[PDB]
Symmetry: C3
Subunit: 399 residues, 3 copies
């Protein structure tokens, strides 16, 4: 079930799949090629199944981080956009769609955390983390908090940790150094120290999660929160005058949040590789192409410099892009699973007073390596099953 003489596209239901098939019907009208967009349940899990048997869609739209596993399984074809078309998108977006120095997907939309604040309580958002403590008691006098965001998630607290020098793995020359962790450098240390300090001073709770944080802002109890474009819909409903802006700066350095980029990948088994490249290069990745998908459903910031500038008219979108530019592309490697979990524990321990800043991060940097075990002994499952899946000759002869 490849396709052959047609195109089949998989994207997530929560996206502008309607907006896409419009560019499908716009393509179909020019080439005579039937484009079918479809959105199956947990496709990001179906794809490793079906593509492994040569079946599945011709292209797949998903976050760039998941493609790492696909590319390593050889499930994605290597794209060949000329230099001219490369200059049409933001250079940083191309670093998000590259596995082993080989380009393996077209960047679509950019997603990053930003600083959301209530314009009523706060006419001017602080440009620095260091003025939050001073700001908090100014607000606490009126029975309001300065800032509240999710602390149970590293994804949310990483921007501050990594603001001074912290980094997952090292990106140098289109390659991630799995042996060059940076959750233990002086940068991370100071980052987390500041965050712990706020909790020790009573400027923040140690048990602030997502729901608590969101609710606090939406009721107008807090002055600021940190969240992405997905939380915008909820605030509009709260009817609370809010603006999204660039994140504050720590020790004069800007915050470095993670960057989730939607990408279009081409099946390595798809016989219509030329057509996919046709569809995506000249039909979708154009002003009207993105416009159309965007109309059914907003995509936040986009990779395409031309259409981005038009969307930038929205202060919120412009801030998401600016935050992403200064941020860090989320590594698509498998060792990333490890990092997440190691850092998660490190922050929670440092928050609860179960460990100290210096100490909990130094346990994490070691703990990350300790998840080399994951790979080894998860392969111990896939290997022992296969040695015994090839000894199926016990059931071949009985039938």
């Amino acid at each position: 079930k490849i396709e052959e003489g047609k195109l089949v596209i998989w994207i997530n239901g929560d996206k502008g799949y309607n907006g896409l098939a419009e560019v499908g019907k716009k393509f179909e009208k020019d080439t005579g090629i039937k484009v079918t967009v479809e959105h199956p349940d947990k496709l990001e899990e179906k794809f490793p199944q079906v593509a492994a048997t040569g079946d599945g869609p011709d292209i797949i739209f998903w976050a760039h981080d998941r493609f790492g596993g696909y590319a390593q399984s050889g499930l994605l074809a290597e794209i060949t956009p000329d230099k001219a078309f490369q200059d049409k998108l933001y250079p940083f977006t191309w670093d998000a769609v590259r596995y082993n120095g080989k380009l393996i997907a077209y960047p679509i939309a950019v997603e990053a955390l930003s600083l959301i604040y209530n314009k009523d309580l706060l006419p001017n958002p602080p440009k620095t983390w260091e003025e939050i403590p001073a700001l908090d008691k100014e607000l606490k006098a009126k029975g309001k908090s300065a800032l509240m965001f999710n602390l149970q998630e590293p994804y949310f607290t990483w921007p501050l940790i990594a603001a001074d020098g912290g980094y997952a793995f090292k990106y140098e020359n289109g390659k991630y150094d799995i042996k060059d962790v940076g959750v233990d450098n002086a940068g991370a240390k100071a980052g987390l120290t500041f965050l712990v300090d706020l909790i020790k001073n009573k400027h923040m709770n140690a048990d602030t999660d997502y729901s608590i944080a969101e609710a606090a802002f939406n009721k107008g109890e807090t002055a600021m929160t940190i969240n992405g474009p997905w939380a915008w819909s909820n605030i509009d409903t709260s009817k609370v005058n809010y603006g999204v802006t660039v994140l504050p700066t720590f020790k004069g350095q800007p915050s470095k949040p993670f960057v989730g980029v939607l990408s279009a990948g081409i099946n390595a088994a798809s016989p219509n590789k030329e057509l996919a490249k046709e569809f995506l290069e000249n039909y979708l990745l154009t002003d009207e192409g993105l416009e159309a998908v965007n109309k059914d459903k907003p995509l936040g910031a986009v990779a395409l410099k031309s259409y981005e500038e038009e969307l930038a008219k929205d202060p919120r979108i412009a801030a998401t892009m600016e935050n992403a530019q200064k941020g860090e592309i989320m590594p698509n490697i498998p060792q990333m699973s490890a990092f997440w979990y190691a850092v998660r524990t490190a922050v929670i321990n440092a928050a609860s007073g179960r460990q100290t800043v210096d100490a909990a991060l130094a346990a994490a940097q070691t703990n990350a390596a300790a998840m080399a075990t994951l790979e080894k002994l998860m392969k111990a499952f896939e290997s022992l099953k296969s040695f015994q899946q090839q000894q199926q000759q016990q059931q071949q002869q009985q039938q």
Copy 2:
């Protein structure tokens, strides 16, 4: 019992040991040294145990791949042949007897897969893989197949995969790079793709094993087969006019099959190191030395350029050598166990449609590292084996955490002649 004033030699039962005894008799008459040659059953298993206790033979003749484990266990003495004697053998053979850039055995005989074809059906064997498809339907018109060989074994299908750039591990400056696998490069990809294509087109069965392939050729149903010098005896009995030649070429590159080289190693515990070096350097590794072993039992191609040229008179032997020269020396490292098994699965999966070439190969690559870690599991078991051996042979809180239960590593078959 090491020896001391004598030379005890071990060699496999199927080899020319009686021919060796002659070279042991001609050595005895010229120095006065009694030379015993014995062929113990499963000696590749006996040697690990006895040489570890300082006992066993002074020298051992076995395939070069097995010596890797021996050398790493410090079981083999480092040889010192001068540059003059080195030039007497083929330079490529010396790369087969080297562990950690130290020479640890003398090369004897070379073994490699070749292209066997029936001269009756096929007067001229194809010089290229790309003409096999065209050839097959030319033969299928007469109710005959063009080619049939073992597909269940990577050993047999590797020559085509590695023909374009595929390689196990990287050999650069007398060192194998365990972190430089090449079963995933563009070379391998195309190699396997072509092989899969033949099976998808109906030019080959997905379940062709060794017995099926051999039988098909020996009955004269197939035009060609790929096999080594060990299968020659069987074809002579079939009485079917056959010639062995260089393997075909893929994308203009020649096939790169594995090369099994018989070698003479010297026990690190043998006090008669000087005598062994004497025996092998000036007595065995000579025209008349090899001749003698060869007479009791053919050794195929030999390392010695002088005697090789005389044996080359046989078209079959000359082809084995030529195939070996263009081939790849089989790495004697432990990570090789892993490779084999990873590639075996990859080919079989690609052969059925259960995975694609791109998919199965990139899989097997990840899986190769996956084993060079359960290699630890063995020492981890042998860490606890000797720990509980000595802690028997005499006369709370976070303790629960400990969980060293899984897993098991199930062994393989032997394989598999006659």
Copy 3:
């Protein structure tokens, strides 16, 4: 209970804590900071618990090898002694208090195995291992052995193995190369070969442990033994005229024993970092500071060149230092656990003739690599239990 404006010190109950307290009293008098010295049970285990929670002492005195784990856990603050003060101590001691090229403790006292011999039986100790065999039968004629020391421990047999080129891991640039083991080089090979030969010739038992060796010397049955400064007290009681001297030499190279160095580390959580650095730099690490600790309890050889020269008056101490200088600082890395155990087995197997020198030494190097990551994974599995 961090502290703040006070100084709490931890040191081993067996060491001269009272001497340290004197130094505390002197600090208090000259500043206004009360210094408390306490020696709790199994403190080197307590510390990892309490320091992980930000609690515990401001400084900790323990062997330098244990600090490796502490430093890696980020439990120790990085010290900043100027170059002037660095020149006051022996340069080799500074290589013992360094984790990842960052200095993390002040060296205090140096400990190393030496050659102890009975002056009555042996007026002059042999300067070379190669003359031991000849010496042994000279002594066996009078019903006495030439040498007896612990063979069950690599710690004791390593000086001879490593004397020709053997080495745990490679120290180059202030960094340990975990991939550059040296228990398999020609140096180690010959080392162990000689040791095995002595046992095969009947110059030594394969089952000589610590107790047996010590007793043999103390009764005056053996002419020589190899042991550290901790065994001195026992010999004095034996009342047997003994002298401690530099270890013999193998193939012209000197023996390379391990060097255990007592160090003062500062808690990374201590708010009185400045005061600790004050206490240790200008109060304890001085002639009168060490003197005082030394009086309650001897510390053997000291890092401080000035006070060392004054203690050198004791032939025994001078020999410990000289043995340490030619020896090998014991690596404080985690892969060290592996080495120990790998070598232990290697020696014992080579002792029994269960393996050859070549074979057993090859096994242990490949063994050290196996149990080294699997002590890293036996913790990875272990932590997933504690975190679910």
